[PDB]
Amino acid sequence: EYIENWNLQNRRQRTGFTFHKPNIFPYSASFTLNRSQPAHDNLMGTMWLNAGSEIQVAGFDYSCAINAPANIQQFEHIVQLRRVLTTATITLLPDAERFSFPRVINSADGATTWYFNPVILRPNNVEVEFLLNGQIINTYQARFGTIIARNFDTIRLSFQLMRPPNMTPAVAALFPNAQPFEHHATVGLTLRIESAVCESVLADASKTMLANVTSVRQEYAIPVGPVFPPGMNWTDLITNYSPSREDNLQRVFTVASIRSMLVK
Amino acid sequence: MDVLYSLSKTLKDARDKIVEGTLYSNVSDLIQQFNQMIITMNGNEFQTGGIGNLPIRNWNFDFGLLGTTLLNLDANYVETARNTIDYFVDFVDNVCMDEMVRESQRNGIAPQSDSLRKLSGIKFKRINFDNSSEYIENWNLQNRRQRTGFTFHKPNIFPYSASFTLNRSQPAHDNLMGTMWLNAGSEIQVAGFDYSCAINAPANIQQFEHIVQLRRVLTTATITLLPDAERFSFPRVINSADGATTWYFNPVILRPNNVEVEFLLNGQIINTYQARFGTIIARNFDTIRLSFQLMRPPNMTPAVAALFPNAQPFEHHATVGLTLRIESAVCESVLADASKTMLANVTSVRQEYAIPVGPVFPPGMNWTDLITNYSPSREDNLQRVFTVASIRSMLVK
Amino acid sequence: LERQLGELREEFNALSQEIAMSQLIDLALLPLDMFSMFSGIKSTIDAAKSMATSVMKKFKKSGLANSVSTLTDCLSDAASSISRGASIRSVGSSASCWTDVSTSISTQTSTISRRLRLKEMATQTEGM
Amino acid sequence: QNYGINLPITGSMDTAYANSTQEETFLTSTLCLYYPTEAATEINDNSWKDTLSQLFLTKGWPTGSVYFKEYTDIASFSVDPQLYCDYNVVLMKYDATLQLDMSELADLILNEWLCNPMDITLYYYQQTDEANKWISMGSSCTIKVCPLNTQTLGIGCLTTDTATFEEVATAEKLVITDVVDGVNHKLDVTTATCTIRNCKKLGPRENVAVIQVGGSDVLDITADPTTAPQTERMMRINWKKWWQVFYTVVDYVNQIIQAMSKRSR
Amino acid sequence: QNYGINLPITGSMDTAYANSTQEETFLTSTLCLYYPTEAATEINDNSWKDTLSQLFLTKGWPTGSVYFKEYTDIASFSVDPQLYCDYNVVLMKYDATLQLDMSELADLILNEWLCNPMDITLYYYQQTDEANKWISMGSSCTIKVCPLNTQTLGIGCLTTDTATFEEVATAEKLVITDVVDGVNHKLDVTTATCTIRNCKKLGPRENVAVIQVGGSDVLDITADPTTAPQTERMMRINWKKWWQVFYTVVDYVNQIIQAMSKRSR
Amino acid sequence: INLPITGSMDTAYANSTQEETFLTSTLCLYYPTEAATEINDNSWKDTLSQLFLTKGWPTGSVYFKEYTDIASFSVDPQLYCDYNVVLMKYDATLQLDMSELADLILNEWLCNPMDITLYYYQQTDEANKWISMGSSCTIKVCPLNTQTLGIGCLTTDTATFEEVATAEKLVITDVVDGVNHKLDVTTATCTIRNCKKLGPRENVAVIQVGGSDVLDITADPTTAPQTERMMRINWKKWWQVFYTVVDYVNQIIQAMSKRSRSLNSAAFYYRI
Ligand SMILES: *[C@@H]1O[C@H](CO)[C@@H](O)[C@H](O)[C@H]1NC(C)=O
Ligand SMILES: *[C@@H]1O[C@H](CO)[C@@H](O)[C@H](O)[C@H]1NC(C)=O
Ligand SMILES: *[C@@H]1O[C@H](CO)[C@@H](O)[C@H](O)[C@H]1NC(C)=O
Ligand SMILES: [Ca+2]
Ligand SMILES: [Ca+2]
Ligand SMILES: [Ca+2]
Ligand SMILES: [Ca+2]
Ligand SMILES: [Ca+2]
Ligand SMILES: [Ca+2]
Ligand SMILES: [Ca+2]
Ligand SMILES: [Ca+2]
Numbered sequence A: 001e002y003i004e005n006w007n008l009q010n011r012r013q014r015t016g017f018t019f020h021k022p023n024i025f026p027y028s029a030s031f032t033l034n035r036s037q038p039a040h041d042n043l044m045g046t047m048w049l050n051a052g053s054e055i056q057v058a059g060f061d062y063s064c065a066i067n068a069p070a071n072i073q074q075f076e077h078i079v080q081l082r083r084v085l086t087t088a089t090i091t092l093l094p095d096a097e098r099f100s101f102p103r104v105i106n107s108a109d110g111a112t113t114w115y116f117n118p119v120i121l122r123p124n125n126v127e128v129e130f131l132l133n134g135q136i137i138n139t140y141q142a143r144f145g146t147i148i149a150r151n152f153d154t155i156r157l158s159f160q161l162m163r164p165p166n167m168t169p170a171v172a173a174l175f176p177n178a179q180p181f182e183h184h185a186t187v188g189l190t191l192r193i194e195s196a197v198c199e200s201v202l203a204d205a206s207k208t209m210l211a212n213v214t215s216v217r218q219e220y221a222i223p224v225g226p227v228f229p230p231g232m233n234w235t236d237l238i239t240n241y242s243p244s245r246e247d248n249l250q251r252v253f254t255v256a257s258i259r260s261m262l263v264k
Numbered sequence B: 001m002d003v004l005y006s007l008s009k010t011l012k013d014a015r016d017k018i019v020e021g022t023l024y025s026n027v028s029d030l031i032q033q034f035n036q037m038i039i040t041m042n043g044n045e046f047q048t049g050g051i052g053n054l055p056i057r058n059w060n061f062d063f064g065l066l067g068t069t070l071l072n073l074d075a076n077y078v079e080t081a082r083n084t085i086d087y088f089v090d091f092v093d094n095v096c097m098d099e100m101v102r103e104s105q106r107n108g109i110a111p112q113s114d115s116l117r118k119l120s121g122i123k124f125k126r127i128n129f130d131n132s133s134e135y136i137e138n139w140n141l142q143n144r145r146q147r148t149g150f151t152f153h154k155p156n157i158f159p160y161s162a163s164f165t166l167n168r169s170q171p172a173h174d175n176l177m178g179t180m181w182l183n184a185g186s187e188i189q190v191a192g193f194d195y196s197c198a199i200n201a202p203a204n205i206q207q208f209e210h211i212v213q214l215r216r217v218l219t220t221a222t223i224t225l226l227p228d229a230e231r232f233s234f235p236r237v238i239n240s241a242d243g244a245t246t247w248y249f250n251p252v253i254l255r256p257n258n259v260e261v262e263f264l265l266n267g268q269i270i271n272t273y274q275a276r277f278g279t280i281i282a283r284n285f286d287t288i289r290l291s292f293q294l295m296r297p298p299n300m301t302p303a304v305a306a307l308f309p310n311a312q313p314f315e316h317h318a319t320v321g322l323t324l325r326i327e328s329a330v331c332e333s334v335l336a337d338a339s340k341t342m343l344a345n346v347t348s349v350r351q352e353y354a355i356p357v358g359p360v361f362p363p364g365m366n367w368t369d370l371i372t373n374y375s376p377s378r379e380d381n382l383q384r385v386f387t388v389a390s391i392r393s394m395l396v397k
Numbered sequence C: 001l002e003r004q005l006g007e008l009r010e011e012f013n014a015l016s017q018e019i020a021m022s023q024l025i026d027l028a029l030l031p032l033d034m035f036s037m038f039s040g041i042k043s044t045i046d047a048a049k050s051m052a053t054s055v056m057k058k059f060k061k062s063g064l065a066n067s068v069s070t071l072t073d074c075l076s077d078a079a080s081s082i083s084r085g086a087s088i089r090s091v092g093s094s095a096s097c098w099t100d101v102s103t104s105i106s107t108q109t110s111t112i113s114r115r116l117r118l119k120e121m122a123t124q125t126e127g128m
Numbered sequence D, E: 001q002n003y004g005i006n007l008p009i010t011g012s013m014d015t016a017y018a019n020s021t022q023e024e025t026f027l028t029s030t031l032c033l034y035y036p037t038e039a040a041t042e043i044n045d046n047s048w049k050d051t052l053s054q055l056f057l058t059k060g061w062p063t064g065s066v067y068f069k070e071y072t073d074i075a076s077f078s079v080d081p082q083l084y085c086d087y088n089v090v091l092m093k094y095d096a097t098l099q100l101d102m103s104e105l106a107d108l109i110l111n112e113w114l115c116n117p118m119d120i121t122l123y124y125y126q127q128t129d130e131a132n133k134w135i136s137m138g139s140s141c142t143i144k145v146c147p148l149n150t151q152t153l154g155i156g157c158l159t160t161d162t163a164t165f166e167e168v169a170t171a172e173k174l175v176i177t178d179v180v181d182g183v184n185h186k187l188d189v190t191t192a193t194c195t196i197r198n199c200k201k202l203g204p205r206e207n208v209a210v211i212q213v214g215g216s217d218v219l220d221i222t223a224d225p226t227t228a229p230q231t232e233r234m235m236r237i238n239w240k241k242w243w244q245v246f247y248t249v250v251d252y253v254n255q256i257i258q259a260m261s262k263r264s265r
Numbered sequence F: 001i002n003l004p005i006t007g008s009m010d011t012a013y014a015n016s017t018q019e020e021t022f023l024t025s026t027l028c029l030y031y032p033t034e035a036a037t038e039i040n041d042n043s044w045k046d047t048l049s050q051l052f053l054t055k056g057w058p059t060g061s062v063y064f065k066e067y068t069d070i071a072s073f074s075v076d077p078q079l080y081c082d083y084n085v086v087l088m089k090y091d092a093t094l095q096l097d098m099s100e101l102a103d104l105i106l107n108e109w110l111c112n113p114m115d116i117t118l119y120y121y122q123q124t125d126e127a128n129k130w131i132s133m134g135s136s137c138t139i140k141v142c143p144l145n146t147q148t149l150g151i152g153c154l155t156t157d158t159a160t161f162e163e164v165a166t167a168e169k170l171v172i173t174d175v176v177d178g179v180n181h182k183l184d185v186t187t188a189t190c191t192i193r194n195c196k197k198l199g200p201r202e203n204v205a206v207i208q209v210g211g212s213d214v215l216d217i218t219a220d221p222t223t224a225p226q227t228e229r230m231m232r233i234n235w236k237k238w239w240q241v242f243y244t245v246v247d248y249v250n251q252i253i254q255a256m257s258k259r260s261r262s263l264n265s266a267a268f269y270y271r272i
């Protein structure tokens, strides 16, 4: 496949590398607060962990949408990939896991901390839009499970947190009309790119070319190069997927596959 | 279909092997085969498209054979080969795109995209080179009926179902006993919850059982079974059955006792597992029965005894969970996976060329609604379109 | 009026089958205005009141009229600010007001057809 | 339309939340306040009930749905209560010297009891679990109990000499007695004035709501001393007048009806 | 430095916890105590302030960062409390007869109220939400209310005969009134010796800290009778002297200031 | 419960719930003062209990509740037991009273209160009736016309009203369902309630000790049914009656069944 796509690129044509669970997202765990205070006691925001082939996003409101209009709060996350993808097979699920238990997180400036005690609800008005050049391509509303995306450079996940209008006592005692708010309503979404195809070269959970490269470099103690970062940290090497880096990466991956065909 | 596979395979092997400087002793056979195919094609005029945004293209084949005088290759040979191969490749791609989109309930195995009905003739039979892939091998076996098999890694056989069942319910939803389950793709996360920690139950024990019934048999399945299901192990606000009101769910995870996992086949038991966690096997099964129990700890420390009182409030609900992931599997029929792109190719083609909904596939080809009803006609059409999608992927991924 | 109304229910449930089909289809293509409906009373019994007003002062308190007003106000507020459209949680690709699900496919379709009950008396029809 | 059967129910999670059943449950239900005579005394008015009803009318509760039922005293109310409405609210005055009395009243009304009768003169009774208690109502109950041994002899008491018994209640209007579970007791009771019944505590009653108008929350519903819990329908206010209390109840009635839910039985 | 606006903030999860701002916040901030006259009375010392200052100096708080501000009584303190410091502490004695006033004081100082004025002679006022209350300060406030109907007529009261109005306060120095939200009220008030202000309770003030000295925790800040919460800056102690209390405060002043947080507004 | 139930005809008849329902249920007899008087004994209750103890019913399950008279018993009957047996003496002059008693206890009523003075009520169906209890009830009724005026009676002159009950302790009244009545009742001495008749109460068992079976529960004079739990003995004494009851208690409990609707101590449900 690698030498074939090499010969294709030399004889310019539409290539393709079939990836299973591609590590295309750089490790990014981070939050965004749209209503904040110094004491961090009534917050509204969204938290996302984009790691390897998966994303886990979650929108949290400490007031459970009591002051908002129509008892609803909107959350949106726009992931803008570095390279295009096609025939992506994706698994979308609700109630993201790692943002679903008690937590003690530092603020932006790392000066003070704040507590986070979530209560998971379902995301309503959920809309997943796979876009390419800003033109929407694929749209899904309330469809969970195994889905497909045919061509996309951007993903937009837009969901809502809706206060249940009818509530039993045990859950009404958790969402009072006062500021303390010791239970914070949350709505989560997990999204894993199980398989896909790409006109460029990446890393996966199936192939060892990247590991052979990095092992060679760690073994023979190569100085930092002008192009690749030190140690070839895939995070800082996918963050800036420039054409020089892409070419050198295709090249080293190809020769690494070639070597792996002989010595394992 | 065999001729389509042979076309794609010989064209792939041609674009791979036919390169400058190489030795004719390595591609003499493939060149004789290419010339034979050219002879079998020359004199025919095919058509492709006309459903949706697919353009209506007419293919005429008038080419010249490749000489066998040479003993080494050169650019004035490779370039001729390429200018002859590109046309066949575009033809095969358009054929596969005109075939992935058509359906029929009456003998769906029988090919649509009538150009392919023609290529299935007896004079076109001289093109079969090797039916070496898994899909074409199983196709041939089915045509000559025999025990087939498709091997899968993390197959998507479970339709997305996320639902509960309460065997003791109340309007105020304050003392409940029930089971929640999420069955999605290759994973089953089940959890039996009791709000009273089995205080009024006999022997301080509460049973829980989850029966799953697969729509297609599986064999040689490798399974990863662990306790303490994760997605039902945090606070939650869930709706009622009729959806009017909501109730709260604050879980506290314990360990399953008297656990028993039974993989059954036609109601008879095949494999049984008592308290074995980790990597296990299941050799033949259309049904799964996960039966566990919640046993009240007879000896309890103060901090935990202060959570399960003898009275109704019950502000912590004892749960017992189980995750079960089918890592590998083998199936007589065709499914989807986390490794292959056939379904992605099909659905993408259909979304791109705006194919209307047909009498067989659901709208957008959603795997949930397409696995929930896996009737023989749907299975046949699915096998057909997956096979030709694999054929197309062998060349254009 | 419970016993009289039950007697009239019985009269309807015994005349219903005595009604004909051909002449009923012939009558269902008639713009039977107020006068056409209230002039042909059996005997115009005794110098009756304005029957249009008499029926309307009960008509505009009921489920039908209140649902009309609700459809009105839920298109109005939705067109005014984006909270109601965004809240009604349609299936997707638009929510003006109509695609609303108060309460799977069966459920959505029934909930939508109980709103399509107003398409008849909204002039959004073409047929019978 | 099956009755008396407990069947497994089933649902889903992709179902959407339905509409607000408030402003219709009010019209199709009934509400009953239980205020003390001191409230009406301090108020010194005779149109306050109609005033509160016209106020409630602004919250949604119609005129002929709300009711005010007076009770002279906590103990008089405790003497044979009959709470029969679709939503009951009770305004309870705090009194240190009535702490156990208004704890037994709370444990009696907040919960739902399955009661059988008792014939002291004939049988010797015993408790099976921590829920089969003995509740005695009347004008003045004076109860004494003798536990018996394997051979139906007394333990530190004489089956004949009534005076050797262990008096557990002295001239009380409502008693809720929990004794050692697993032994046969013999009782002396002033049956002319008080009736006692063997009652097993079932799950809670969600139809009534107690509101301690004064001091700190002391009510210990659970007879066992370890838990001492506090539920949603056990509220507290601080008071210097009663008009303010009734205005507050009215303004936060929807919170009360959210904390409460109609009866299962 | 975009004031008057609110923008999305952002960050990450890889940054490490920075150094301890303690031993600097004490120096660049100020601490004001509010003790009762009974404390200095029992003490009978003139240098106890310099003593507590030299003690704070060991914990880190410098000499001229500490302030003491006496108050003869809880009601005299409730009369226009002007808390202007960077960390306020308030030692509060318990009295079962003053419970409502010392709970109104808590609901007034613990929170941050947005207060608009009020003129009773001209207008008739109504509430919109459950946090838009009417707070009356002065030496002796006697407040009476008459709700009105849709057509501007009273309900159990007459718009001329002030005697028929409903009384909620009687010679109180501080009052906090909540009424039915959706109805216009006509008011009678002793405007000469009391000022009433229509205030909306915003988010809380994290700058003060109430420390009850005596009885159990009873303060129901939230006017609605469902929460009855216990905030983090609502402390309790049991006392027999005052020197022990001040030593406790000084020894645990860091936990106090961790429970408090510099204001936002 | 609105859900369905499912079963199968291949299953096996399980063991007898008898000899365990006796242990986890309670029984309660209602005998007249005449019976204790004829008996002239003080330990006959403990005797009967020791006799039940052979039939399986344990010591602390059987109860006896004396009632001075049928009418005093019909006045607010509070039946709170898992199984109730009633011994009822026949009397022609009390036929209608002991038929109203039967209609009250054998059936399960859903009652609302009735304010005579401010409002006027009507009956809708043949199961919505007006039951009045107390020491001396006297009920007069005037049905009204479409324009809220009397029919053969005057809305003011209470003597013009039509008297349906005189000097009765319990009265069950069924009037023309669909007209508005104005009532005159001794509210000070008798409270009246609009009660709908739900399905039957399988917890009680009436035993007519003397005369033939005459009780016509169903107010319509077209059924005159004889339910399973409506029994008859012929008597010349009371000891033989009690021995018969004790020796054939199993058949009685086989003819009865625990309630289905809910738990309640009185003879009816209240819904305001
Ligand atoms: C649902 O509740 C909202 C808020 O009370 C109301 O505006 C809306 O009309 C309700 N829906 C219907 C169908 O009445
Ligand atoms: C923070 O604390 C560490 C350890 O006490 C110290 O080494 C460091 O210098 C401190 N930071 C600054 C800015 O002084
Ligand atoms: C039911 O009765 C049969 C026949 O006497 C007996 O064999 C069986 O053990 C009984 N069932 C039980 C659970 O004892
Ligand atoms: Ca008592
Ligand atoms: Ca006990
Ligand atoms: Ca003794
Ligand atoms: Ca005050
Ligand atoms: Ca208010
Ligand atoms: Ca007045
Ligand atoms: Ca009678
Ligand atoms: Ca007359």
Ligand SMILES: [Ca+2]
Pocket: F123, F125, F126, F127, F128, F129, F174, F175, F176, F177
């Ligand atoms: Ca009738």
